[PDB]
Design a protein around this ligand. Structure first.
Ligand SMILES: [Zn+2]
Length: 193
C-alpha cells in the first residue's frame, strides 16, 4: 500500500518547524503556516526543522519521502522528469531520479525500495546545534512542480519520519511542497485565495 502520512509525535514529541523567512523576492524557501505548505526553488537550500520534547538516542535516523497528494495519483512513484533525470546534476551520491536530496551531509543515504520502488533519503539524527533549540536538515528538491513528464503541476507532500537504528517507527510528520521560480510570490497568491 501507499506509505502512511498520518501525523504522530510519538515518544519524543516529534514536530516539524520552519524558518520564519517571509516572502521577499530573494527568498528561496518560504513556509506557509496557514497552508502547511513549503514554497521553494529548484536545487536551493530548504531548511526543515526537527523539534523534540526528548532527545532520541544516537543511531536515530530521519527519512524524507515525496508522495502525490491527489488520491488518483497516490500509487504513482514521485520521481524527476526525463529532462532533469538526464541532465547530470547529481552530486555523486543521489540517484539522478530522486526528487529529494540532502545537501551538506556526507552521511546521507538513499533508498530505492525493493518492493514499492519509492525513493527516500535518510540522514542520522543529530541533536540541536549551538544557538538553536531544533535540529535543521537542508533538503533540495531537484524538479519544479511545473516539470512536464514529471510531477506536471500535480501537488505533492513530503513525509518526514523519525526511525531508530533498527528501523522502528518513532514519529511522523508531513508538509505540502510547491517547487517554483518565485516561492514568495506563490505563497502570497495561495494565501489570499
Ligand atoms: Zn524536472
Amino acid at each position: 500500500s501507499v506509505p502512511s502520512q498520518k501525523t504522530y509525535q510519538g515518544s519524543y514529541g516529534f514536530r516539524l518547524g520552519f524558518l520564519h523567512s517571509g516572502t521577499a523576492k530573494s527568498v528561496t524557501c518560504t513556509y506557509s503556516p496557514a497552508l502547511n505548505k513549503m514554497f521553494c526553488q529548484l536545487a536551493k537550500t530548504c531548511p526543515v526543522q526537527l523539534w523534540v520534547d526528548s532527545t532520541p538516542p544516537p543511531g536515530t535516523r530521519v527519512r524524507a519521502m515525496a508522495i502525490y497528494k491527489q488520491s488518483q495519483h497516490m500509487t504513482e512513484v514521485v520521481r524527476r522528469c526525463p529532462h532533469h533525470e538526464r541532465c547530470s546534476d547529481s552530486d555523486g551520491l543521489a540517484p539522478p531520479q530522486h526528487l529529494i536530496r540532502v545537501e551538506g551531509n556526507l552521511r546521507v543515504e538513499y533508498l530505492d525500495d525493493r518492493n514499492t520502488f519509492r525513493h527516500s533519503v535518510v540522514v542520522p539524527y543529530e541533536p540541536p546545534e549551538v544557538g538553536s533549540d531544533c535540529t535543521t536538515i537542508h533538503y533540495n528538491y531537484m524538479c519544479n512542480s511545473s516539470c512536464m513528464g514529471g510531477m506536471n503541476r500535480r501537488p505533492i507532500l513530503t513525509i518526514i519520519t523519525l526511525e531508530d537504528s533498527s528501523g522502528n517507527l518513532l514519529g511522523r510528520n508531513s508538509f505540502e511542497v510547491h517547487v517554483c521560480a518565485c516561492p514568495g510570490r506563490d505563497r502570497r497568491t495561495e494565501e489570499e485565495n
